[PDB]
Structure 1
Amino acid sequence: QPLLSVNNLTHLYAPGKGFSDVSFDLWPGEVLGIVGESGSGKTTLLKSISARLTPQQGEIHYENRSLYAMSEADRRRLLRTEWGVVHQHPLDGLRRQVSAGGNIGERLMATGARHYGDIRATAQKWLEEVEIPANRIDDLPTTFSGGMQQRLQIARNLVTHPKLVFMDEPTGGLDVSVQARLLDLLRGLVVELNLAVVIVTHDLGVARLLADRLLVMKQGQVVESGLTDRVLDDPHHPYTQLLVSSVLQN
């Protein structure tokens, strides 16, 4: 059975603002990228499928259980233990008054960790895995740079090895080297731990290197879907052709 099944999902603030009639399937170990013109509803869809926005229509099943038919406590538990959520703004998925070590260790303690030393060691290791130095563990994220904050929110939502991770422009604000270091990490987690990823991004290169399948959104409507390679190299919808043409050839 699919890890996450979305059927006729819809949520619109106004005609043309949001998304409508969106359906897809996500199995463990594959990445489903989402692309489209800015304001196409990618963020709204990501929030709706991550139990962050009740849809106006449609349904979402997770492991044969309707996502919004369960109690709020169950959804909170899912978002707290086995579901990662990287936000477009790094500070949304961070605690400003809590140090980086505390931000990373909250997720570990929610999973049952109760040894301070091990939590600190894991936080230092992950800070290093996302290219932040260990001596910044006790520093608040407000003193970090935008890329540092984004890489802290990735580390925070991957420290627990969740089964399903939702991302909104995770690579934004990251340099190419740390970007590739973060893509390699995700590939390793996916192949080894069978992690599922739903990523919203504009950099088509990241989707090509990472996304197993791709979706295209325009005016809140899913226009194109299928394999990432087929969509990127053999686009059908005119907007997809324009987007691939816009790619800055090096």
Structure 2
Amino acid sequence: PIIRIRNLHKWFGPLHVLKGIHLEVAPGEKLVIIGPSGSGKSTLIRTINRLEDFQEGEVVVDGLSVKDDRALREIRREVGMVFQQFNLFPHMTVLENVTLAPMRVRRWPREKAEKKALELLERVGILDQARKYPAQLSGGQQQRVAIARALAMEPKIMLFDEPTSALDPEMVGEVLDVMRDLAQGGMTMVVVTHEMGFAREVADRVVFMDGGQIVEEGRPEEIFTRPKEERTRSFLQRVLH
């Protein structure tokens, strides 16, 4: 599998936040992670691209240990991330924001970088904004720039940590649409979300976290209409309908 996590334990000071997670994600997999805030979802996906370390267990991405100091560069080349907050460079255009890393990191000539960026911007519906600055864009558009930027590095894995959670309600659908499109293809995707209709339509597999644990996982239909675990049923009665 392209992501391999065995017996992951993680402490923030005295707080046992991740409690022996096992997770094996296939190449091409669309994995959706759900669960109450505080359950440990962000922390878990942050261990994948080495934004968080941990004291017990193993985390291996594309056959490389995340704790291998010699991998902490290849890991960032092949793993993209979209956060709920956009961190665009305010004094660079949309286009410049997208081409920066492929130019800095992959040492792509600007003409190559821009050609790919432009195709990506069209892909996510914002080619018209190519020469705008981030402050002229809505929340929906800015997050789509962040997605284009992540994809511009051409990673094998895209992590989405609740990309729509901080957006105005009318901004959510357009960002989710970009993620629906990407899910039609072969990219490995891990997305944390509270958008359950989306989760249900896109996921190969849904993982429910509570208390720093994977309490239940399975196919979307099973998890949403036949949850085998009580805490799962309890979580779904609190948030659905």
Q: 1:219 aligns with which of 206, 211, 216?
A: 211
In structure 1, runs of 5+ residues without a counterpart are none
TM-score (norm 2): 0.87
Cα distance in 2 between the residues matched to 1:10 and 1:102: 39
Cα distance in 2 between the residues matched to 1:184 and 1:215: 18
Cα distance in 1 between the residues matched to 2:92 and 2:17: 33
- Structure-2 change in CA distance of 1:182 and 1:222 (3 Å): same
Cα distance in 2 between the residues matched to 1:179 and 1:137: 17
| Pairing 1:1-250 to 2, within 5 Å after superposition | 2-13=1-12, 18-71=17-70, 74-79=71-76, 81-91=77-87, 94-109=88-103, 110-114=105-109, 116-134=110-128, 136-172=129-165, 173=167, 175=171, 177-190=173-186, 195-246=187-238, 248-249=240-241
Cα distance in 1 between the residues matched to 2:101 and 2:68: 25
Count how many residue pairs are aligned between Structure 1 and Structure 2.
Answer: 237
Cα distance in 2 between the residues matched to 1:211 and 1:201: 11
| 1:229, distance to aligned residue in structure 2 (A) | 2.2
> SS at the partner of 2:19?
strand
| 55-64 or 149-158, which deviates more | 55-64
| 1:180, distance to aligned residue in structure 2 (A) | 5.0
> Following superposition, which runs of at least 4 residues in structure 1 exceed 3 angstroms of deviation?
14-17, 174-177, 246-249
| 1:102, distance to aligned residue in structure 2 (A) | 1.4
| 1:117, distance to aligned residue in structure 2 (A) | 3.5
Q: Is the 8 A contact 2:139 2:171 kept in 1?
A: no
| 1:14, distance to aligned residue in structure 2 (A) | 5.3
Percent identity (aligned) = 31
> What letter is aligned with 1:42?
K
- Structure-2 change in CA distance of 1:10 and 1:142 (3 Å): farther
Q: Is the 8 A contact 1:17 1:40 kept in 2?
A: no
| 1:125, distance to aligned residue in structure 2 (A) | 2.9
> SS at the partner of 2:236?
helix
| 1:84, distance to aligned residue in structure 2 (A) | 0.8
Q: Is the 8 A contact 2:4 2:25 kept in 1?
A: yes
In structure 2, runs of 5+ residues without a counterpart are none
| 21-30 or 139-148, which deviates more | 139-148
Cα distance in 1 between the residues matched to 2:235 and 2:171: 22
- Structure-2 change in CA distance of 1:11 and 1:245 (3 Å): same
TM-score (norm 1): 0.84
Q: Is the 8 A contact 2:30 2:183 kept in 1?
A: no
- Structure-2 change in CA distance of 1:129 and 1:61 (3 Å): same
Q: Deviations over 1:28-65 (max 9, x none)?
A: 11111111101111111110122111112111112333
> SS at the partner of 2:4?
strand
Cα distance in 2 between the residues matched to 1:67 and 1:214: 24
Q: Is the 8 A contact 1:30 1:212 kept in 2?
A: yes
Q: Is the 8 A contact 2:140 2:172 kept in 1?
A: no
